[PDB]
Amino acid sequence: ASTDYWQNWTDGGGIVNAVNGSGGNYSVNWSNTGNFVVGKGWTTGSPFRTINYNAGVWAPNGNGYLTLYGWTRSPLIEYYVVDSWGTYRPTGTYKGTVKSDGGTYDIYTTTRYNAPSIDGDRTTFTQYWSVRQSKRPTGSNATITFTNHVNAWKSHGMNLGSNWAYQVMATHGYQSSGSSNVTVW
Template identity: 35%
Template sequence: MKNYFSKNASILLITVGLMSCAQEQQRSKAESDVKAQTVSSIEKYQAYTQAYTSNTVLTQNHATGHVGDLFFTHWKDGGSTSLALDTEGDFSVSWEGGGYNYVGGPGWHSGKKNRVIGYRFNEDSGATYITLYGWGYDKNMPTSNPAHLVEYYILQRWTYDPSRDGSFGKTFVSNGVEYSTYRSLRTQQPSINSTSTFYQYWSKPSQQRELGQDYEINFADHVKAWADTGWIIPNMNNFDASDDPTYQVMAVEVFNPGKDGTASGRVWDASSQ
């Protein structure tokens, strides 16, 4: 009986081991396929997309790509602004005063509804917005419907109040912070899909976030709050738009800055922490 059990136990262990090995191989292959597909798809933006394995500084008008595992966007329509990045998520934006618009920062080449974003800002000389920022796009919706393309902001610090230009949605609490939502319409303005008419969704906290502290943004709470008033974000994980993927980044935005300034911080994915 003892020998019989040992023999069958051995067979069982071997079988389980083989199954685990096969499952691991399937999982590895699936991950490789996703990475290959991502690389192949993102090459569509090869005019801008670059990959860096060490610290870098961007000064051109438009650049997207990766520094280490993090995606970045860097866009301006004039003026002088630079974005410094490292592979660990630290970044710094420096700008000169002038009549132009800039937005940039690190994050991910796609948005995820359940992502928890960790960040810390140590310096802010008066950026227009410090915000979680991203896009959703549905190429199958008619372009006459502004909801086919959505630019979203979850503000953390600001010098311009977007609520003056938007329609109020609702007030809700996420991570102990009270936010109010707004929606505004952009008519024939620059976007990730050329010049388009689209919606902007906003979440604005009742108080600005302090510098020098670690914070988390539960993105799903904001998606739900927007949806509660009928403001749905289209697909946040595609390469269908003409100019950029549907990225999600912790961004610094300045428009028509009156003087030179700097904002610096760090971003990370806190979903599994």
């Protein structure tokens, strides 16, 4: 599946040398960071998607997520399905779990008041996450069957927006340094 959205955000601090290359291929060389996100994919998120990535470099120095990343509206919801990471494995309020794509994922919700969004500014939104338990191997062809996670959340009072925004396989950071070459499709 040929991708159409490209994401390259940075709060401004440190370095994010993010290269948009051929098709679904992207890469990031970051050093001394604050906040940043990079990701290829689609401009309207679907909950029916099957995402295909292949992390060929995944070398964090600290707090990172190789995570499915996306957004919705009515209500504003920033969500994740984290397949791996560097030093810190994300969490929040446990609801349950869910098997998909070989991994079992923990379910969590977190509240963020005063912080950017696809509206911008400092504001609130709720965050649904599915967090893998082991760190999923990189290197080879991975698959995020996402309906699985949307059906999951839904049985946990985690419903999502009527209005779909961007949905990308992303490289997430917060005051870390490191490296990633992924390819999405």
